Design a binder for these strands. Structure first.
Ligand SMILES: [Mg+2]
Ligand SMILES: [Mg+2]
Ligand SMILES: [Mg+2]
Ligand SMILES: [Mg+2]
Ligand SMILES: [Mg+2]
Ligand SMILES: [Mg+2]
Ligand SMILES: [Mg+2]
Ligand SMILES: [Mg+2]
Ligand SMILES: [Mg+2]
Ligand SMILES: [Mg+2]
Ligand SMILES: [Mg+2]
Ligand SMILES: [Mg+2]
Ligand SMILES: [Mg+2]
Ligand SMILES: [Mg+2]
Ligand SMILES: [Mg+2]
Ligand SMILES: [Mg+2]
Ligand SMILES: [Mg+2]
Ligand SMILES: [Mg+2]
Ligand SMILES: [Mg+2]
Ligand SMILES: [Mg+2]
Ligand SMILES: [Mg+2]
Ligand SMILES: [Mg+2]
Ligand SMILES: [Mg+2]
Ligand SMILES: [Mg+2]
Length: 73
RNA sequence: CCAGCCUAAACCGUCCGGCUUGUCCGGGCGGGGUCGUGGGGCCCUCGGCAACCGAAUCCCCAGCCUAGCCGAAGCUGUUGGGA
């Protein structure tokens, strides 16, 4: 069972991270407690989004602060 | 006997719901697509088509079905209860 978890669990790993688990642990616990989600191709593709989103957002907030330093120095 | 066809998916637009604004997550609608010389999508170059095909869908008609109608040519005698 592949599931991207939405919470840092000492068991599995950190948020957003994808990891393998026994189906039971997922179907009967992680899933209902919302702690994690199915690594479905649909959701997985949407996870590639948040990465690119903030990979841009950060590589631009900092990218803009590259000119401010380019003048005060 | 005779005959071949429509979609799902990639792709684009829209509507509603969702987030952490992304050619992004889902749902419905429309466009796109449909085959084994493998085909389609998206990009570059040629018509930027009159045309050529065309129904298993509609519309009119013929025909046919459910009543009908026209239709040739004979008389006499005889037996017999009756020709
Ligand atoms: Mg489908
Ligand atoms: Mg598509
Ligand atoms: Mg669109
Ligand atoms: Mg859509
Ligand atoms: Mg709607
Ligand atoms: Mg909305
Ligand atoms: Mg959409
Ligand atoms: Mg469609
Ligand atoms: Mg078509
Ligand atoms: Mg079509
Ligand atoms: Mg084809
Ligand atoms: Mg080219
Ligand atoms: Mg052209
Ligand atoms: Mg052309
Ligand atoms: Mg023209
Ligand atoms: Mg006729
Ligand atoms: Mg007939
Ligand atoms: Mg009749
Ligand atoms: Mg008569
Ligand atoms: Mg008669
Ligand atoms: Mg006599
Ligand atoms: Mg007689
Ligand atoms: Mg007599
Ligand atoms: Mg007689």
């Amino acid at each position: 069972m592949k599931v991207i978890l939405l919470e840092p669990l000492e068991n599995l790993g950190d948020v957003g991270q994808v990891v393998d688990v026994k189906p039971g642990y997922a179907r009967n616990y992680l899933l209902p407690r919302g702690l994690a989600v199915l690594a479905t191709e649909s959701n997985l593709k949407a996870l590639e989004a948040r990465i690119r989103a903030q990979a841009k957002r950060l590589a631009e907030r900092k990218a803009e602060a590259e000119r401010l330093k380019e003048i005060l120095e």
